[PDB]
Symmetry: C6
């Protein structure tokens, strides 16, 4: 029975944070995990199987799918959320071991927040650069196995685009909250 130790550890982690910033960030993080695990996972389950191309050429469908989708949307978002969470876990464990040393910080917190914001911005920039922010029902594929210029069709472009819009909005809101936290610290300093 040491529930108070967890409370003290949580308090020390969030000591240098805005009153509303930390609560909004935590709720948004839980929201993002729930949305990614529950909803978008099922939508992308049959992205390759439902993919087809208007050709008889053997092997053209999967090479055209690979050209169309260099990396899957849900796996890219999993990478994004994991890299965003990494600095938070690092800071949590670091301050926990600092507390252990004290039993027998602000600057590192700033570096962690700045790295998380940089990760958000970089992931968003890559997500925009690779394919933009929307999915088209018809995809024109030019690949070596396929003869001339072949035509292929996506699984469910509209629903995927809608979920893309939600993920982009969530990323933007998280970035804005992190920038607000940085401005709050600059106000403190």
């Amino acid at each position: 029975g040491d529930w108070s130790a967890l409370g003290k550890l949580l308090d020390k982690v969030q000591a240098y944070s805005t009153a509303g910033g930390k609560v909004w960030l935590s709720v948004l993080f839980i929201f993002r995990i729930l949305l990614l695990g529950t909803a978008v996972e099922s939508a992308w389950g049959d992205e390759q199987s439902a993919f087809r191309c208007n050709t008889q050429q053997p092997g053209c469908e999967n090479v055209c799918y690979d050209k169309s989708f260099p990396i899957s949307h849900v796996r890219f978002w999993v990478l994004q959320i994991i890299f965003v969470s990494v600095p938070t876990l690092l800071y949590l464990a670091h301050v926990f071991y600092v507390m252990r040393k004290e039993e027998k910080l602000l600057r590192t917190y700033i570096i962690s927040i700045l790295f998380k914001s940089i990760f958000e911005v970089a992931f968003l920039l890559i997500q925009w650069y690779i394919y933009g922010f929307s999915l088209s029902a018809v995809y024109t594929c030019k690949r070596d196995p396929c003869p001339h210029q072949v035509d292929c069709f996506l699984s469910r472009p509209t629903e995927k685009t809608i979920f893309i819009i939600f993920m982009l909005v969530v990323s933007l809101v998280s970035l804005a909250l992190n920038i607000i936290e940085l401005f709050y610290v600059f106000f403190k300093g």
Copy 2:
């Protein structure tokens, strides 16, 4: 061993709520989660695979499915329930941190309830606008890949319509309970 802390936190969250309103809302929320997770998830598992169209045109089936279903029913309901739960979690965490500050509210509760009711109404309006409240066995699809005007068939329209009716009724009852809670607060004030 700090079970009493959770009880105090729960009491403070529900202090400004009707005696029957909170209990009915919590039971309805558990009921909605159980119904969504257990029953409707399986019914929509093969919505795209069982979907077929009466044509030989390559790629017509999935574009017609995408036109017919801009967003899946179960994923839309997951979005609805998550956005409904978001203000409750926000208020819970906020009042928890307020209690933490007190160790070392009504107006925000009203804003949270009003936002949850607005989310309910907006989700219901979108659900009505996109496709209505029923599913037809036969769907007429007009799309660019498909020549002229093609005919397609849904997986299991009657069972999907029945579950649509249950979800609509549950949403209506939850909205009514929230409106009753708002009227109760207006009586208090």
Copy 3:
């Protein structure tokens, strides 16, 4: 460490119940959950995929399946068990909050039991009205897409019928136990 609080809450819920009635009902409820989750779920997994019709008409198979099965058996039983459990959860939470008020009932218990029995009877009546209590290997389907009068075959009719018989027997036994509980209360009053 507050295990005694849960014991007191459980005692207050079951205070107005027969000595053997509550134990038999709880064991039967656990039995029904285990039987539904473990056994009947797998049997109905391929109800639509294994379904086929003796025709070349596109889209006839799924419309005939939809006509044959307005709602799936396992999902209907999930609805039944959930609606049966709803009054019990309502009474549990209500008496819990009544205990919380006392820290700082019989008639409602009777209404809950009566509603649960009415739910049992109504679900059984609908289950009998829609399709009866057995499944036939051969199904004759008359639908608009299908020309004239087509013939279709179910996945595994005998095993499904056997599980139907078990679920009907369990529902009958639960209804009998609830009626015995009502008669016991009438004896008390």
Copy 4:
């Protein structure tokens, strides 16, 4: 923190049992659950999909499968284990409530053991009567849709037969242990 209450409850349940009988029965029960959940479940996953018949008749394959397998092996074993466990759970809950009454048995234990043994014997007799104790690679099916006398093939008959032999041996050993427990009680009385 009330771990001792569970120990006292467990002691009272097993007070009227043989020293080695209860331990062997509990270990065998855990063994049966693990074997059923982990091993035999996967072997029967594709029993119907891998099933095929040497005919062009539409709908003959599934009607012949239904004739060959009135009820699946794993689901029948789940039914058997559940009905075997039911008297144990009934006795556990009953003696728990008897202890609760005492805070504010042998004959029923004998009835429970006898009913569990009768369930074992009856399930074994049905399992022998329906299809015996082995599976044949080639099955001859005579059904109304199929013309004349058709030939079908099972998924994996040898592995299924091996698992049948293990389940039969486990059932026999459990029955023997229960009979030994009954003889021990008769020695006591």
Copy 5:
């Protein structure tokens, strides 16, 4: 809060064991469970579906698969690990009840270890006798449905052979550790 009781029970079980023997055996057991559950399960998922034979004969593929694989590799290994674990669980529960009696062993431990070693040796001998220690890409099948002598191909023979080699090595190491434990006891006696 009775964590010390579990520690005392664990100490009494391992009292008659070598200092390094028990730790190595426990780590190897966790390693075997993790390897079996995580890695080899996926490799054998499509053993029958990916199996095919170079013939047009209906039903030849599955009878040839059944001849090639009397029992699946992963299910055989599950049987092996379960039978290996059975004596350990028996001894654990037995010594627990002996401690309960004391509140109100070496020879049986030796019998348990000897039985576990015998199980290891017998399972290894059967695994060698049935098919050896490797899998061939090409399998020659002679069965009644198949005409003359047919040729079939395995799913992924090289990866399956590699995992066979790991499981054989793990079984050998566990057998060696058990033999070392037996020699240690003989040194004690």
Copy 6:
């Protein structure tokens, strides 16, 4: 309630470790588990089913797949992470039993770290030797069943290559951290 015992055990394990080394290693280990379980598992789900070859030869596709992929990428990475974790678990259990003996180390820690680094290097060398660090969309297969020199296509080569690059980078970083820990100990000695 013995939470302090776990803290003391954790402290003794990490007593001979660098302040930042242990925290970075633990965070990287959690990161690797999350990345492997969540992201790369789905990408390799249909590696064999989506695999196809440009030939009519029966059985050529799976033999060419087996030649192309001697062992799956995700299963190889599972083997790597498990063998990396094995020395850590061995040291944990060993020091736990040493603490138990004390109630009634550095050199072994060094051997464990050195073995973990050797495992990292050996797994990386095998991963480089078998197939390198990239996947090509087109694979040329020469096998006995296939006539002359056949051509086959991978499922999703670009995404698989991207995940290969992440796993290689993670392995390199973990190896570097282990080497830094070894240099730190050499500084201590």
